[PDB]
Amino acid sequence: PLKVEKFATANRGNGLRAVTPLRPGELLFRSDPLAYTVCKGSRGVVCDRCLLGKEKLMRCSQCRVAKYCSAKCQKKAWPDHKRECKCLKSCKPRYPPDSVRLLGRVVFKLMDGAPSESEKLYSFYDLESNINKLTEDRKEGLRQLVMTFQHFMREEIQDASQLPPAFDLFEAFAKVICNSFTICNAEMQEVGVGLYPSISLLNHSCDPNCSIVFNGPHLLLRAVRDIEVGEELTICYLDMLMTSEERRKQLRDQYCFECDCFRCQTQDKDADMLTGDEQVWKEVQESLKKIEELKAHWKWEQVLAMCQAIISSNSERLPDINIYQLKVLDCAMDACINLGLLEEALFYGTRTMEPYRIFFPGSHPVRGVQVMKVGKLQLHQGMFPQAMKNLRLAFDIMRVTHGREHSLIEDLILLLEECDANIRA
Ligand SMILES: C[S@@+](CC[C@H](N)C(=O)[O-])C[C@H]1O[C@@H](n2cnc3c(N)ncnc32)[C@H](O)[C@@H]1O
Ligand SMILES: [Zn+2]
Ligand SMILES: [Zn+2]
Ligand SMILES: [Zn+2]
């Protein structure tokens, strides 16, 4: 039986609440997507189906756009790819926005597929559109996405008879804007976008009591605090390394609400996040636009070079608790790990540990994963007591955020055993 239920909230639409008392780490729901796609940066880098990276991917011969890890993935993907394949082929060399490829897959799934377990608690039909809150600038954007979909899909979808009953493309894209999930790989790299309509019942908090984690396209929802019967379940929609001003902007622009948690009234953590010289951090925040774009496209050498120019600047430097500096350290660590510069990775990674302790309170999967990365780098280098410390800590966090149902926890258990054996010997 379910441990969660849909309910009507007082002022934030529908939500999800606990039916039984919940403890940290408890699995509350699990879902495959209604629909998902690889994201722009990762296309041709990770398998379309399993979202795992490979050195060499095999392309779909018909469209040459979909790429796969294996014959098993290409074949398994074919039913959900076959209609988009003709559209992707037709519009070559144009490639659509991710939202447009996503909605195409939504439409084909709803037209051709059996009712989806992803819609058990709540359906695409039910999703919030916020249409009475959209600004004229947003409505113009949505109009353009509708016309882009009509162009991209024209080989497969010519009229309304090929859309679900009463389906309105403008409304559908408004639902995609505020109900898209970013799918992250095991290393917390963004690799895809998906719709998970049951999980879309969860409302936002800047200090949430649940968390989601991805294992390929599969989503696990877990409690990360004690929760009482009847208590609303929340997740944080946003990256933790954001000031209240930045959260306000994104919650308005993407989700059309004003968040009234304690952290937002009190600007909790903002001052410590913005320590250091403001001219310098403004420059680094600007440089991060490019660094994050490069990272999104897995360009690790260009990422490292830009990060080193900041971390080791001749000019004024920032404290590592400054969130822009911190994001630069984290990109530099990940670029080093991917490039096999393991000593340099560990330097950057260890610098992030105290700031991550501060900015990811409680049990947050991003901190779990960071601590595991650092442990693994220390294990490699023969630093056993320190690795063991960090691997235990990663486990204390990831037992709650990831759980036994997540494959990374098995990987971590193997590092723990290896490290323990080394210490014992
Ligand atoms: C993923 S949906 C969450 C479920 C939604 N309340 C519903 O009725 O379908 C996100 C939308 O929920 C509302 N929302 C989520 N968190 C909220 C919050 N903390 N305060 C006010 N509205 C919130 C906003 O309308 C937002 O665009
Ligand atoms: Zn695959
Ligand atoms: Zn194809
Ligand atoms: Zn808030």
Side-chain angles (χ1 to χ4, degrees), residues 1-22 24-53 57-61 63-71 73-74 77-85 87-88 90-91 93 95-108 110-116 118-298 300-403 405-425:
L2 302 169
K3 300 182 161 184
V4 309
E5 75 188 356
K6 179 178 108 153
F7 79 117
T9 72
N11 61 34
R12 49 203 197 188
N14 298 129
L16 205 64
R17 62 183 172 195
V19 172
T20 68
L22 306 171
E26 192 150 358
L27 185 60
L28 304 186
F29 207 86
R30 63 192 298 184
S31 192
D32 292 323
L34 171 66
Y36 72 107
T37 188
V38 70
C39 63
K40 176 194 177 189
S42 296
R43 178 166 68 96
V45 178
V46 308
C47 175
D48 263 53
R49 171 159 176 287
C50 63
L51 307 175
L52 294 186
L57 291 177
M58 41 210 282
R59 82 204 162 163
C60 175
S61 182
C63 66
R64 288 182 174 185
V65 170
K67 297 180 181 157
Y68 304 99
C69 74
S70 59
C73 276
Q74 178 170 348
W78 176 247
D80 288 350
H81 174 64
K82 58 183 301 306
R83 298 186 66 188
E84 70 161 11
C85 181
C87 303
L88 293 160
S90 195
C91 306
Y95 187 78
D98 296 352
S99 60
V100 171
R101 185 167 183 197
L102 181 60
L103 189 62
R105 289 174 160 259
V106 170
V107 168
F108 300 136
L110 298 173
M111 292 306 297
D112 300 320
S116 171
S118 70
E119 296 182 307
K120 179 185 193 151
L121 307 182
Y122 208 52
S123 72
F124 187 80
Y125 178 87
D126 298 321
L127 296 174
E128 176 65 71
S129 69
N130 288 312
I131 286 171
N132 67 359
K133 291 182 188 177
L134 306 178
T135 62
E136 177 53 38
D137 188 70
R138 171 67 79 187
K139 294 181 178 180
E140 180 60 25
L142 295 178
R143 285 195 291 268
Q144 303 301 315
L145 289 171
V146 167
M147 286 184 291
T148 300
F149 175 95
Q150 294 172 313
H151 173 94
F152 168 66
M153 300 278 99
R154 61 193 195 281
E155 287 284 312
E156 283 298 323
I157 304 166
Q158 295 85 37
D159 80 291
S161 58
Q162 292 144 310
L163 297 179
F167 198 86
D168 185 284
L169 293 171
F170 181 96
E171 185 184 0
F173 277 109
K175 291 171 185 261
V176 169
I177 297 317
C178 60
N179 295 284
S180 287
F181 288 81
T182 299
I183 298 165
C184 296
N185 68 17
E187 295 72 41
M188 296 291 180
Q189 174 82 337
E190 295 182 1
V191 291
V193 64
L195 298 174
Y196 295 81
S198 294
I199 310 299
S200 289
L201 278 168
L202 294 148
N203 286 312
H204 168 82
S205 172
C206 296
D207 180 20
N209 63 11
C210 297
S211 172
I212 68 177
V213 60
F214 296 94
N215 197 185
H218 190 74
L219 183 163
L220 303 177
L221 174 63
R222 308 192 85 88
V224 296
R225 299 299 305 265
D226 286 316
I227 304 174
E228 302 177 63
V229 183
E231 179 169 8
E232 183 166 12
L233 307 181
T234 57
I235 59 170
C236 189
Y237 295 178
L238 304 180
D239 199 285
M240 296 317 288
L241 305 185
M242 288 182 79
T243 66
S244 64
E245 170 184 299
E246 287 174 323
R247 297 199 303 276
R248 174 173 292 108
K249 180 169 177 51
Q250 187 171 349
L251 297 179
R252 279 168 176 183
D253 287 356
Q254 179 170 356
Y255 300 101
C256 298
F257 74 96
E258 323 291 347
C259 175
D260 83 331
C261 81
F262 171 73
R263 298 193 62 229
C264 290
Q265 284 198 53
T266 64
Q267 306 193 212
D268 182 65
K269 304 190 184 75
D270 289 357
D272 282 1
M273 290 184 166
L274 303 175
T275 48
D277 180 86
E278 176 197 13
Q279 182 55 30
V280 180
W281 63 246
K282 291 279 195 171
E283 286 166 7
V284 173
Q285 169 187 41
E286 180 72 11
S287 300
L288 274 164
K289 300 176 191 300
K290 176 139 162 205
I291 289 166
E292 286 172 357
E293 169 96 331
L294 290 164
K295 171 170 145 199
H297 290 78
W298 296 70
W300 307 114
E301 297 193 336
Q302 289 184 78
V303 167
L304 186 55
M306 283 194 79
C307 291
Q308 288 170 332
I310 290 164
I311 293 160
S312 297
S313 54
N314 290 330
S315 55
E316 176 158 20
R317 292 181 186 173
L318 295 173
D320 287 356
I321 56 165
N322 175 284
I323 51 172
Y324 308 111
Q325 175 73 3
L326 180 58
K327 290 162 172 218
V328 172
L329 291 168
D330 179 60
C331 286
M333 176 194 71
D334 269 333
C336 287
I337 288 171
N338 280 285
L339 292 173
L341 301 173
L342 301 193
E343 299 104 347
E344 196 182 338
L346 179 57
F347 179 60
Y348 304 136
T350 195
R351 285 168 69 167
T352 70
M353 294 282 91
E354 178 66 5
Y356 270 40
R357 185 186 72 70
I358 297 162
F359 290 137
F360 297 86
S363 307
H364 194 292
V366 165
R367 182 177 181 228
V369 169
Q370 192 83 347
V371 174
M372 182 175 178
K373 291 182 179 168
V374 166
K376 182 170 181 166
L377 288 159
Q378 292 168 149
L379 171 60
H380 176 255
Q381 228 107 92
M383 309 164 214
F384 310 128
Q386 294 67 43
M388 196 68 193
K389 161 93 94 310
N390 281 147
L391 300 170
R392 287 184 192 279
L393 178 52
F395 192 76
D396 286 345
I397 297 163
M398 298 173 50
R399 180 188 32 74
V400 170
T401 62
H402 286 60
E405 297 82 9
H406 199 293
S407 63
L408 196 56
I409 266 292
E410 296 166 0
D411 298 357
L412 178 53
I413 284 158
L414 290 174
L415 304 169
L416 279 164
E417 289 169 355
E418 182 181 346
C419 191
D420 203 36
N422 274 250
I423 289 180
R424 289 284 142 29

